[PDB]
Design an enzyme around this catalytic site. Structure first.
Site, short mmCIF file in Angstrom:
data_model
loop_
_atom_site.label_atom_id
_atom_site.label_comp_id
_atom_site.label_asym_id
_atom_site.label_seq_id
_atom_site.Cartn_x
_atom_site.Cartn_y
_atom_site.Cartn_z
N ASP A 148 0.81 -1.22 0.00
CA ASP A 148 0.00 0.00 0.00
C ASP A 148 0.85 1.27 0.00
OD1 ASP A 148 -2.32 1.54 -0.10
OD2 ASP A 148 -2.47 1.63 2.10
N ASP A 370 -8.09 -6.62 9.38
CA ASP A 370 -7.54 -5.52 8.60
C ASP A 370 -7.67 -4.18 9.30
OD1 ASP A 370 -7.00 -7.30 6.50
OD2 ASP A 370 -8.97 -6.96 5.60
#
Length: 443
Positions: A148, A370
């Site tokens: 990311d 997450d």
């Protein structure tokens, strides 16, 4: 001292994390009322997963783990017992301004020069110091480099946080690559997002160019990056078995123009890795680069998986009935409801030549959240991201609900209900493991 190989996974075993295995086995024990499910969970506990250095405190140890040295020592013992090379999967994940597209401050280091100095001296340097110890020359380390990160700079640069983070992603990734590539048994796999983020030509192309710029900024150039890894901590399927032709048109309407695909030609990670391998080579990388897919949570199995083509004249009905990815939208990254475990980790999987796959790996460990689904007070100082919020209609999802799993704990914490679903919905199905003592009628 051993020569640096093209594919560290070939002929090798992968490290199994005993801390995560214990978490899985504890979850299996809590399924005493469903013994078949418990047996499948026990099988999952034997699989290799990556160890995440998701904050500086993870290096020495914290509430979530026993420190990097613990794992490296375990890995050398596992390699000795295997008698073949062993790959220890390690995630480098602490850039200044981390996760700049999240509408939250998710990274512990700010996007400032002070944050970068800490990234170098207190995060990368101690990790590299451990990895370079002669005690670990007998193992190989596959370092997944900063999930990311870099592709935010070509897709999400309209967000001020990503503008602020941009110089630190470039300089931080350069530093990580320089320090880690200097260690001959470390193999650097740069994160490449997934097809639901970068599959469009307008995103894939600029991303490949940026990766080449980063490579050329390192001291070793292209040699600094051994390969690339897709789908880390995501759920985009390995293959869409029924939607195998992304150029299919129905009554002069391309199925890729469906709401779910938004004109993207890459419906799955096999196609995405083949696509990116081409573009990366064209951008300057040697053809020898290899690809990994994180198959931890991309199986999309269970009873909701379509098993044959449902006919339709309407492209959206056709796509929605026939896709195995059951998410509301491919941008849903946080605990999407219904996800299942994918292919077990495996060296050099066959049948996908154009994807140049070194291995399937479990980078994200199945069962770890997450992110939290509400703004819960916590002793990690972690912040709330509405992409994890079941109540949030997200502009990032074409104005649709996240479909996030409710009752989610902080990132990295055990997510009981999610793990149940992940195992139930595994594709391929999981077989059960039963210890020998449970084979006798209880007396």
């Amino acid at each position: 001292a051993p020569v640096h190989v093209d594919n560290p996974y070939a002929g090798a075993v992968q490290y199994v994390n005993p801390t995560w295995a214990a978490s899985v086995n504890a979850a299996a024990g809590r399924q005493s009322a469903d013994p078949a499910l418990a047996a499948k969970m026990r099988t999952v506990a034997g699989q290799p997963t990556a160890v995440w250095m998701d904050r500086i405190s993870a290096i020495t140890g914290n509430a979530d783990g026993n420190g990097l040295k613990f794992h490296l020592d375990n890995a050398v013992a596992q390699q000795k017992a295997a008698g073949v090379p062993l790959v220890f999967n390690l995630v480098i994940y602490d850039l200044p301004g981390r996760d700049c597209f999240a509408l939250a401050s998710n990274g512990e280091l700010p996007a400032t020069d002070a944050g970068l100095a800490r990234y170098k001296s207190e995060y990368i340097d101690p990790i590299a110091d451990l990895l370079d110890n002669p005690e670990y020359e007998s193992i190989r380390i596959a370092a997944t480099i900063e999930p990311d990160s870099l592709p935010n700079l070509t897709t999400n640069i309209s967000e001020p946080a990503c503008q602020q983070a941009a110089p630190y992603y470039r300089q931080g990734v350069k530093y990580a690559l320089d320090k880690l590539h200097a260690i001959p048994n470390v193999y650097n796999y740069i994160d490449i997002g997934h097809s639901g983020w970068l599959g469009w030509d307008s995103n894939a192309g600029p991303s490949a160019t940026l990766f080449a710029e980063v490579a050329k900024s390192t001291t070793a150039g292209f040699a600094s990056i051994d390969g690339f890894v897709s789908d880390v901590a995501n759920t985009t399927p390995l293959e869409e078995p029924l939607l195998s032709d992304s150029s299919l048109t129905i009554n002069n309407t391309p199925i890729r123009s469906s709401k779910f695909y938004e004109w993207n030609f890459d419906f799955d990670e096999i196609d995405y890795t083949a696509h990116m391998h081409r573009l990366l080579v064209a951008a300057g990388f040697p053809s020898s680069i290899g690809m990994l897919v994180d198959t931890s949570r991309n199986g999309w199995g269970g009873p909701n998986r379509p098993t044959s083509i449902t006919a339709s004249t309407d492209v959206n009905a056709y796509v929605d009935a026939n896709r195995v990815d059951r998410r509301v939208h491919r941008g849903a990254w946080c605990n999407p409801l219904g996800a299942g475990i994918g292919r077990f980790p495996e060296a050099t999987p066959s049948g996908y030549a154009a994807s140049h796959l070194d291995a399937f790996v479990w980078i994200k460990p199945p069962g770890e959240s997450d992110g939290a689904s509400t703004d819960i007070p916590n002793d990690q100082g972690k912040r709330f991201d509405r992409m994890c919020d079941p109540t949030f209609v997200s502009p990032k999802l074409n104005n649709q609900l996240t479909g996030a799993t409710p009752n989610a704990p902080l990132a990295g914490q055990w997510f009981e209900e999610q793990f149940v679903t992940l195992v139930k919905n595994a594709y391929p199905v999981i077989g059960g493991t039963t210890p020998v003592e449970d084979l006798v009628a209880p007396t």
